[model samples]
Target: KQSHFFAHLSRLKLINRWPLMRNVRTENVSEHSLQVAMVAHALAAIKNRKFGGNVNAERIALLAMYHDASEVLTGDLPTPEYKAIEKIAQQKLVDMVPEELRDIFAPLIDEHAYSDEEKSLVKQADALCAYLKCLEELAAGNNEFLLAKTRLEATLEARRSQEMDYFMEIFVPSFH
Candidate 1:
């Protein structure tokens, strides 16, 4: 369990922030985990109260905290590389994880028979984090962030949760 924790730390270096800025800055795993946890909790609450979906906010937060843990061994393949060849990318990550940590990541990577609803919550949190990061870069006067923010906005629109919109409106302006 302790080693699994370090596995998360190792991912800090692999992930970068601001897709267009390319250099606004990168966030560490610890920072990302906090953001994801916060977003997941808010989203889960929204789903439960607004959509009549049953979800445990605390549990969702915990799941989001570890959503990217696999990146530690996978070296944060950029979206282009990952989506371009998803199967190969997934196999590479599976091959890279140490035998011990493999078990820790197995459930996250494999969707079969798993709770798809839980996975959906993690994805929502991940996207929310990206949107928040874009807002941060924009606040820093990074023109490069505009495109990323636009893209993220489009995605958020598709997801369309009042809670997410409320959260974004509240925190995003502070960054501006």
Candidate 2:
């Protein structure tokens, strides 16, 4: 038989997000992951090149690709519900990984394992992805995302890394 892991991941395409809200278009994990990966890559690169930080953009992008893989097993719980059990959910997914890949995946899934800077950057990238999603929804005339857009913008602004500020000023408008 084939490995069930890959098969489960493939089901990500079938999982629709924001199930309670109306969307101009449906968003799924596979597309979200791709967007996150790209955003993560840009964040890491900007941090390294413009902010004088030492980072591996490729590694950051790779980590972002699997950032939501646990959702494949747990389903996408909304923020508060998911945060309440985040640690438990992360460990469950880590445990499911093959032994050979455990070391590689541990840091990606476990916040404690990543460097402080790496963790911050990845979190920023994640938020940026959400913000962009909200933008997409807003551009499509959905007020359902208005509150989310406001909240995420405030969070990103409060965090305010030099690279993140640059991204917000320079790249984000293109999404509209």
Candidate 3:
């Protein structure tokens, strides 16, 4: 059930209570995930239609929607905090997933086995989500997001492959 999937999100505070600029409100993983999925879907579709990628946009969207389901349990780790001790943070994230879910994701994480392209799509989507967040903060006149926006743009540039490039060339401009 969708409710079961979202059960852990209610307990976690997003980005550790970082307030949205000008709104005096904070965002949650749920809202972030939904937007990311939509962006991922559009990107995937652009790839398939214009770049000859063999991806199902809808499927990618669904995967993106659930990409951070584990975060519901692990909590949203600040990117900089995690980057400081990358391996440790990764292990912690791995350990946070329930044993039962491991069985579900193991094959997906293993590229040689199941080819979890969906997971890759979600990762790209997550980056886009981060970029959008940066844009929002900047639009709200928050200088704090400036560096993050730069980093996010660089990440998106590096990650752009196949239709992702087209996505960036087209839809990404609308946000700025």
Candidate 4:
């Protein structure tokens, strides 16, 4: 009865990110979202423990997992356009899942489910994921990600937070 619920999200594995860029290894939505979740949890934990804030790392992780779920339906549009289309895509996703599980799946589709701080953490993680992807590609000799990496770092610099900076300083170096 509920077969389609999980299956729809599971389908994210087939959806690729960085569609326009050349990749040595193709990146998919599922893995990208997983990276986002892990980074979000780290950011959330740092915010709570290091910065003297209280936030749920677990919930933030879940929030990041489905952060790109709308792409499952919309096939990964570019920003502004993706932003405009994602609202309806999420709603459409909610429609595809079973009704009884909406209470659970509903919030996963809603970025608003998290608090503002949590939201930004997820976004930081999202950018981190992209930045890492760029690094990995560049390391593998793919220069197509060079410009994307440059702009992503600038974006990262502008949005710096204690936890974000902590993550960049302490954790991000391994990727290089």
Candidate 5:
């Protein structure tokens, strides 16, 4: 028998997201999760500070770190079946855990169980990471991300959280 949970994460860097695209820099789930965590924290801070709402910043940041861990099971490619595969992948990761640690570990791994508010914020944060990823590759003179950059903005608008919009206005612009 053979099984490894956390160790799968180290292999995440080898599973590239934009594999079909020709580009100078490629994005993998390992580094993708890092920026997702950071952007999640920033959006939480924006809501708390600018909008006078109370929310857990660091906890969500930590959850965002594992946001794409499920992708490791799906091998980081695009498909309509991604959600279905992610559903199983999430549970498998949880099953790999011991019962005592399940309560805390479960929240980070399975976002399907999160509240509406949590889901919205988490979704926006990951999308922001995608936008930034496209922005970075384009800045490096790669035209491969053209449609991706456009398509992501439509997702950005449809998924709009005011705090995330604030992030793009203030932070996302200077990267250009």
Candidate 6:
């Protein structure tokens, strides 16, 4: 039998993000996932070390790795469209994972059923990654990213955590 599960995951590199908008540097889900994972790990560490919160950095990182795994199957839907049908799309991906791996990957892929703290951190990391990408485009002199950057900044500001605030202050400037 041909086991296509992991092979399908590998196709993530082929699916480019932000298809509706012109990009200064095209980003694939593979690279985006890694950046999210790193950001998740850092956010978790910042919570635990600096904010005195109890969070598992390693688990957060792993969760972040698969945050967009469903996109491999559904392609990268724009935010507004994706949100409208998020639950249906999520179920489709959850059903795709082999039974043996479901226990491991389900929580990561199925955002509705997961540890609240972990989900929160991963979501924050996802937003941070998007913000960084916008910054990158802006740095490349792409004014098209200006509105996106402003919108993401506002969203991020509303969802601010002490850890996220710390990260923005110390690490974000270097991105430009």
C-alpha lDDT values of all predictions: 0.66, 0.80, 0.63, 0.85, 0.82, 0.85
Residue-by-residue lDDT tens digits, candidate 2, 1-176: 32356666677787777777788998998888888888888988988899897898998888788777767777877651556476776777777668887787777776667777777877898888888988999998999998888898788887678999888889998988
lDDT per residue, candidate 6, 18-41, as tens digits?
888889899999999999999999
Which candidate leads in lDDT? 4
Write candidate 4's Cα lDDT for 1-176 as tens digits. Answer: 64565677878999988888778999899999989999999998989998997998999899998888988778976441555688888888888777777788878787767678878888889988889999999999999998999999887887689999899899889998
Name the regions of candidate 6 deviating beyond 4 angstroms: 80-85
TM match of model 2 to true structure: 0.88
Q: Which residue pairs does candidate 4 place in steric collision?
A: none
Which tens-of-lDDT digit does each residue in 1-176 have in candidate 5? 34476776677787788777886877778888888888888898999999886889888788888888877667876521667778898898877777767787788899877767777788899888888888999999998889988999899999987797799889988889
Off by over 4 Å in 2: 1-3, 80-84
How far does residue 174 in candidate 4 sit from its true spot (Å)? 1.4
Q: For candidate 4, which ten residues in a row score worst on lDDT?
A: 76-85
* TM-score of candidate 4 versus the correct structure, residues matched by position: 0.92
lDDT score of residue 66 within candidate 2? 76
Q: In each prediction, how many residue pairs overlap at the backbone (N, C-alpha, C within less than 3 A)?
A: 0, 0, 0, 0, 0, 0
TM-score of 6: 0.91
The RMSD of every model to the true structure, in order and in angstroms, is: 4.1, 2.1, 5.0, 1.7, 2.0, 1.8
Q: In model 5, where do residues sit more than 4 Å from their true spots?
A: 1-3, 79-81
For residues 62-127, could you state the per-residue lDDT of candidate 1 as single tens digits?
Answer: 777656655554555544145434444444555556777777555544433137777777777787
Displacement of the residue 49 alpha carbon in candidate 4, Å? 1.2
After best superposition, candidate 3 residue 83: deviation in angstroms? 10
Q: Which of 4 and 5 is ahead in lDDT?
A: 4
Clashes of 2: 0
